[PDB]
Each structure stands twice: as structure tokens, then as C-alpha cells.
Amino acid sequence: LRAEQTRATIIGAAADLFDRRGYESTTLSEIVAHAGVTKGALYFHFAAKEDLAHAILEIQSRTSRRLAKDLDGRGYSSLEALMRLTFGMARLCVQGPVLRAGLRLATAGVPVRPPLPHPFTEWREIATSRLLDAVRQSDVHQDIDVDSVAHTLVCSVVGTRTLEPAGREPRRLAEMWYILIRGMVPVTRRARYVTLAARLEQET
Amino acid sequence: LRAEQTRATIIGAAADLFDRRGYESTTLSEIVAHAGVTKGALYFHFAAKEDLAHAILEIQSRTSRRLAKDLDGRGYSSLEALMRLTFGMARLCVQGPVLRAGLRLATAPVRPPLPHPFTEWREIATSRLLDAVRQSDVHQDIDVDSVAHTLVCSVVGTREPRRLAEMWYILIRGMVPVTRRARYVTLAARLEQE
Amino acid sequence: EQTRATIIGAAADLFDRRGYESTTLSEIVAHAGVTKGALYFHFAAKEDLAHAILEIQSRTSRRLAKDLDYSSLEALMRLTFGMARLCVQGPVLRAGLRLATAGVPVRLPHPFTEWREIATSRLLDAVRQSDVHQDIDVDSVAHTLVCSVVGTRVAGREPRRLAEMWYILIRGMVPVTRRARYVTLAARLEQET
Amino acid sequence: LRAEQTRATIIGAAADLFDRRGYESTTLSEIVAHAGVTKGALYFHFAAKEDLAHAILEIQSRTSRRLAKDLDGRGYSSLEALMRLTFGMARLCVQGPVLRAGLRLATAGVVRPPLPHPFTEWREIATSRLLDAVRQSDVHQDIDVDSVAHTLVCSVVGTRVVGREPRRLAEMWYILIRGMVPVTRRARYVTLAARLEQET
DNA sequence: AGGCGGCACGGTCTGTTGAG
DNA sequence: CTCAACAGACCGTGCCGCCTGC
User: NCBIfam families, from UniProt (chain A) (predicted)?
Assistant: First the structure.
């Protein structure tokens, strides 16, 4: 019946088990423990734990797909919506147990279920195709890089940060943009983005 | 240490399998068949599987101690020694897999009390990017962190070192004074291939 | 229902080659077209499926038993070439043959002690009519008669595998009197198509 | 090699459970406890339990060739060999479950050369040894050897073991001499066949 | 520094029964 | 005749350290 809800009950806890322990360390006895289900109830929705990793990566590529287009519509444009794009994933990497594992389950092991659209080329091209918009609007410089800044961006956005608690993850991201707009914005409206960066910290 | 090359060829294949697979993805089955010796010889140089991910990181932080002292033996500027160190610590993670596994192991667990590479590399910059402020090659206002948090996926997220100097421009155009900026900008693009 | 004969016939082609025990209840459902909740309204067990596929065999061995209209020795030799033309006719019977060989969760009488006890009655009654010698160990015959037809493949030539096998018995069992009366009754039963 | 003392302990208890419960039911957790080893001591000798088939049917096949070199040119005829050989398999069909499992695995392994296959290796030794048993009497000049080949191999099944084998075979041979052998050596070939049973 | 062996879970999935 | 969930061993083997005759 409505026990289709009793399916993300393990995903929201297999991600916390994926992000903290890693992939090849998450025992299915441990995953099925942090949930409230039995060894066979997990198999009814997932063939292998490789199928629990390729489906948990769709909950990431589809939760940033509806936050990079549905977030638009009205308000923000070019290099102004790129900041709000990050200050929201930075929240869901803290206030959400799911997609903070997808950032790790995309470097320490790619899933093996066809097809394989890698999420890094989904960020090193959603930013590039939006970074290209800032040159034709005088929001950034014109002599700067065109493709060497995108892979530089989705990079410091990661920064691993695990090592440190999830309290300085959305607030250190504000320092990343603080240094970035120093070598991009043509100085005139440089403080127009610092005013936004220092205020996007404590929200989603 | 005479015929100790037995353990010198174990970590050579142990690092290649820790890179083209993973840590636990690689078992002792192939790691002794891909190397070329029995398990009875493996347990004469190493105590366990974790002692490999403890003898590989301690050769990654042993190379991060030789090249770190080879730039302080000439006469570089503190900011110059820091930026010619990120091009040296990136020309090694492209060729040899014996040091690429340390890039792969220290991500998905080091054995105590060895200093972790992330904690070490992030404090190598802070110590260097502070004497680079005492020489007034870096402004005093900007917080020095500003560290390896940005120089992370330089090789992870995968000409290639051209991406390294591409972000050095964005840093110098912000933390380095506008006068001494013309030096380190053209002295970082001076050579991206060596 | 009609599906009662569906999850038992499609489950017969997946029983012989696989070996029953190695046949998953998932592939049975997938190869029958039914559901995993439809099987358990008609069987409720994979053990109850074996007893269900042997009952359609033992009740077709006693359904061919209603043929007591020739000589008592012939009302048995005709069953031999009447059984070889059944275990090749479709997946059924063969799946019952494959199941009876290995572990049989039977109980429908015994798997083979019905073809050894009731395939000797239609032979002992052929002794009191003097088609079989009265001074032979008759129980020693049925215990060593239900093989051969089991075959060394458990080609396609099976009647000749049994016709030139029946001849060995009709030389030391059936008297020299009516010996050819059943020798010729094998080359004529050797032709099917 | 002490492993030979252990590898023989595992393969023996494995064939005992193969003879009774079959291959598709022999629990691996029950073998190591029925033999006296551990789950890993078995893996050092057998990866998967398909190697408990190419190691059991390897003995069943080699012991067939070891019961042919003892009867090479010993002095037996071309039919006296198959007579003292059918009671040769009657040995380890009761005294040892090893070869007893060999005369049972007719479904498992369904096929991979150069495995002799326990039926092509028994139809051959029957057919290619009756070609000389049709010359020096013993076999009539009309009995198709290729037809009794598929009959001779099945017949060794005998009983429920597919007792009751070492005595059911005696009647199986006595009822087969009368219908294949001349009436001059019919009472002479059943001679060392009624006595060729009171010990096997 | 051997070949042989000790336990234990890694995950895959099996034949099953309560919601409605 | 259904979609759901149920526990449980099924077989691999991974990783180690006991006494072990090639």
C-alpha cells in the first residue's frame, strides 16, 4: 500500500551510513539496522547495494536539477543565481542526510548501473554555461578563463571539510565566493556581491 | 636492509590496485598475485592490510618532507616557495601510482600518531602564507584560510597543470599587493610544464 | 481454473533441466506469466508443487492401465512402448521422471514401487497362463526391469533401445513354444510415426 | 602433505551427503561439520562446490581405469572381464560412499572436456569390449552390441540406489546370460557368477 | 620466509506471509 | 489473485596465524 514511504526510510539512513562510513564498509546488516526493516525488505526495493548507490545518486542529480531551473523564473540572473545555487546545496549538505553522501559517492567509487551520467560534468557544465552568461553582461571580466574557472569552482565547493563538523560547511563557502569575486567582478559593483555573500550563510 | 626489495615491489602493486579500484575493493587475493610473491612473504614485511595504508601514506608524507626542504635550501620568497610547491606536489600525482594511492587512500583513515596529510598540507600553507605576509608579498587583511581547502581537486576531480595556475591568478588578484602582483602573476605562468 | 494447468506445465519445463531444487520460484512465476501471489492461491508451497506434478503422472499411469481388453504378457509389453511414447511427449511426465529420481517429497503411492509392484501383477497373471515359466524368481524380474528405459541420457532412438532389449528376456523367460509370438510383437511395436 | 589427510576427509564426507541428500541440497555448512574441518579449510582445496564434482567424478572415473589395468591381459576372455568387473563396482558402491556418489551424479554437471563423462566412459568399455566377445563364442552373431550398450549401462542402477545392490546384480547377470550366451558356456559363465557374488 | 588451515560475514536471494 | 514485507542461511572468500614434509 502506502509502504512506498517505507523505502526512503533506509535511503535517508543509508546515506548517513554512506557519507560517514564510506561505500565498501557499509554492511547491509548495518544499513538494515539503521532503518527499521529486515534483510529481505531491503531487497524488495533494491537488487544489490550497487543499486542502492546508483538510485541514491539520482536523488542528488534530480534535487539539484529542480533547484537550478525552478529556483529561477523570477529574480537573480547570470552570476547572481550561481551564488544562490550553492547557498542551498550547502544547506542540504548539512540539513539533509541524503545528498551529502552523493558528494562522496561520486569520488570514492562511481556506480555501475546504466547509464552513467557523472555528476561532476553536470556541475562543470551547469556552471560553465552560466559562467558564459556573465561575460556578455559585464558582470565579470572578459580576459579571464572560460573553462579553467568552472573546474576550479566545483572543487573548492567540495573541499572535503569527516575532518570538521557540519557547522563550518555553509559558512566557509561564503569565504570561497569572497575571494573569487576579487578576480572576476570589475571592481565597480564588487561590494554588490559581498553584501549578498555575507547574508546567504544561515539559510537554504 | 639488503634484499628488502621484496617489500619494495609489494607496495608498488598495492598502490596501483589501491588507485585503479579502491582500498577494500582490492583484496589480498590479487594484491599478492599482481605483485609476485606469496602471502607468507607478505606477512614478513607487513603485519596486516592496514599496515599498507600506513606505509603508503608515510611515503606520501615522506616525499612531502623532501620537496618541502628542497625549496628552503636555495633562496626563494615565502610566497614563491609556496607556489612553486603546488606545481611540484602536482607533477608527482600525474606520473607515479606509488604516490597517487596516497591521494586515493587519504580521502575515503591514517594510523596514529602519524600527522594526517590534509592537516599537514593545510598547515604547510598557513605557516608559509604567513611569512609571505611578513615579507609583504601577501596582504595582511585577508585571512590566511585561504588554504588547501581550494587546492583539493587539482588532481582529484577526474595539459592538466594549466588548471593549477588558472586558480593562482584568481588568488594573486586579491591577496597580493597590486605592486608585487605583476611579478608572481607572470612568475606562475612562467612555466606550467617541467 | 485454467491457470491451475499453467503454473504446473510451464513449471515442468523448468523442472527437468534445472533439477527442481535449483529452480527458483521467481523464474517459475516469470516463465508461467502468473504472479508470485497467484501461485500461492493454487499451491502455497514449492513442496506442494512436486506432489502436484507427480499426481498428474501416477494418475496417467493408472489411466493407461484401463487397457486389459490382450494376453496378460502383452498387457505389459504394450505398456512399455506406450510409456516411452509419453515421457518424450511434452514437458510433463519427464518432469515427474526427473523428480522421482532425486529426493521426492511424495505423499499418491511410491515413485517406483508402483511400477515394480503393479508392473509385476500384469506379469504374474501371465505365468498362470503359461506365457512365462512357473519356476523362476518373478520378483527378481520387476526389480531389474524398470531401468533400461531410464536410458543413458537422464540420441533419439528409444524403441530400438527397448525392442532389441526385450528380446533378451524372451529367450530365458518365455517358453520356446510361443517365443516368436512376442518377438515379432516388438519390431511391430518398434514403429511409431 | 597432511592436506592429503584432510582433503580426503572432506571429499569422503561430501560424497556421503551427495549419495543420500543429493547435490542440490547438500548444505555447505553441514559438510565441514560432517567431515571435521572449517569453512576455510575446505576453500583451500575447493573454491566452489562444483569442484566437489570434478574431484569426486574424477575418482569415479580414474577408479574405472584402475579396474581395467588390473584386468589387462591377465588371462580372462572377452566376456569374463566384464563379469568380474561388474562386481568390481559392487565394491565401493557399499563399502565407500565415494564411488557410490559417482553412480548417482547423472544429473549434476550438465559437458566440459576432457572429462570422460561416466556414461560415454561406460558405454565405450562395454561396446568396444564386446566386439571381441562376439568372435570367441560367448555372443551370438545377431545381437546388436550398440543396442545392449544402452541397456548394460542403465542396468547397473539395479535398485532404489539410483540394500540393495550387490545381490540384485547377481540376478541381473543370471537373467542376461540366458539370452546372449551359447548354451555350451551358459552354465559355465553362471558358475563364476553365482559364486562371484557371495563376497561382494 | 612455506603450504594449511580458522572463523566469520561480506552480499545475493530465496520461499514465504500480513495489509485493505 | 495482489503489492508489500519477512527472516534466514544460501555459498564465496577475505583475512589472518596455527604446526606443517613438498
Answer: ScbR_bind_reg
- Name the protein residue, with chain letter, whose CA is nearest the C1' of F22: D1
CATH number of B1-194: 1.10.357.10
Please indicate whether, in this complex, the C-beta atoms of D148 and C171 are within 8 angstroms of each other. no
**What's CA C148's distance to the chain center, in Å?**
12
Mutation for testing the B interface, residue in A146, A152, A175 having most B CBs under 10 Å: A152
Q: Does C154 contact chain D (CB < 8 Å)?
A: yes
CATH topology of domain D1-200: Tetracycline Repressor; domain 2 (1.10.357)
Non-local (6+) Cβ contacts of C59 within 8 A are: none
Nearest protein residue by Cα to C1' of nucleotide F6: A40
Domain C1-193 sits in CATH at 1.10.357.10
Query: How far is Cα B120 from Cα A112, in angstroms, rounded to an integer?
Result: 34
Cell of D137: 563364442
Backbone angles phi, psi at A97, to 5 degrees: -80, -10
The region, left, alpha or beta by phi > 0 then psi within -120 to 50, assigned to residue B183 is: alpha
Total residues found in chain D within this entry? 200
Q: Say if residue B55 is exposed, middle or buried (CB neighbours under 10 Å; 0-12, 13-18, 19+).
A: middle
How many whole angstroms separate alpha carbon A71 and alpha carbon A63? 11
Residue A138 amino acid letter: S
A173 vs C68: CA distance, rounded Å: 95
Q: Domain locations in chain C?
A: 1-193
Residue C163 phi/psi, 5-degree rounding, is -65, -50
User: Any idea which nucleotide's C1' is nearest the CA of C1?
Assistant: F1
Pick out residues 16-45 of chain D having their CB under 7 A from any atom of nucleic acid strand F: 26-30, 39-40, 42-43
DSSP state of C3: G
Q: Which CATH architecture has domain A1-204?
A: Orthogonal Bundle (1.10)
- The gap between B44 CA and E2 C1' (Å) is 12
- Is A81 near strand F, with its CB below 7 A from some atom of it? no
This PDB structure is determined at a resolution in Å of 4.0
CA distance B175 to B185: 12
